[PDB]
């Protein structure tokens with residue numbers, strides 16, 4: 207019946223200064239997946255403290271601790287879309303904040319919403335995509351299919367359910383106006399994680415980069431938020447070869463698992479979901495050239511200091527070309543360690 211023991215222990219000695227985590231914690235070279243999972247909740251508090259959102263928005267620490275624990279427990283354990291993914295995506299948001307000086311481009315509340323969105327953007331993911339929800343006529347599909355972005359709307363709904371859980375509403379004291387603004391930002395930012403959305407606004411993103419970002423342009427704020435969210439979501443591609451390789455293993459383990467379920471339903475899965483047809487190296491090269499590289503290229507055109515990011519993504523693409531080892535699907539052991 208010791209309901210408060212868990213969060214109390216987390217805050218026992220206060221919030222740990224971000225500088226004390228790792229001297230390289232705020233560098234683009236840092237790999238957040240290396241941090242022990244049991245230390246991630248405190249790391250979240252550390253980043254929120256460094257960005258000073260707790261002071262700026264008068265956030266209640268105990269409530270925030272409970273909220274962070276709830277978000278972490280809100281993730282299931284599929285190979286890729288788990289808490290460590292949300293954690294690493296959130297860390298990249300922090301990196302962009304520190305390295306690109308986002309406070310000079312976005313309003314403070316927008317950056318706060320972006321970080322919280324990163325934490326909650328994949329809540330309750332089961333390892334299957336939107337196409338599958340519709341094909342299996344799931345309860346989530348029946349609920350959101352009409353509006354599109356089925357899983358994305360579910361993730362947002364789960365985030366709201368957490369805020370509505372006793373003792374977890376970190377925005378409870380907000381005025382009605384600011385509360386609605388925060389929930390609307392979270393909705394729009396999480397919805398931006400749907401690739402379909404990114405592809406639709408891509409030309410608007412290029413135009414903004416072409417004419418130059420304008421802090422007084424409301425549309426630019428919305429567009430930048432979408433680009434940044436996508437940038438955080440695919441940040442595993444900005445690390446070293448070992449990370450890109452490992453993440454590929456996790457994502458395809460998920461993709462092939464879904465593909466197997468589709469075949470069992472009497473359906474024909476897309477090639478990239480079929481372990482008997484997919485050739486991972488080529489699929490990664492395609493992903494890099496058509497999705498990842500263009501996103502970080504845009505980021506570079508807007509932020510010169512983001513060049514090293516685009517550079518790493520391009521390098522990793524090169525690595526895949528030197529790997530393209532010859533079999534389709536994944537090895538018997540489901541590993542690419544070799």
Ligand SMILES: [Mg+2]
Nearest residue numbers: 327328399400
């Ligand atoms: Mg997602």
Ligand SMILES: [Zn+2]
Nearest residue numbers: 291327328439
């Ligand atoms: Zn994600």
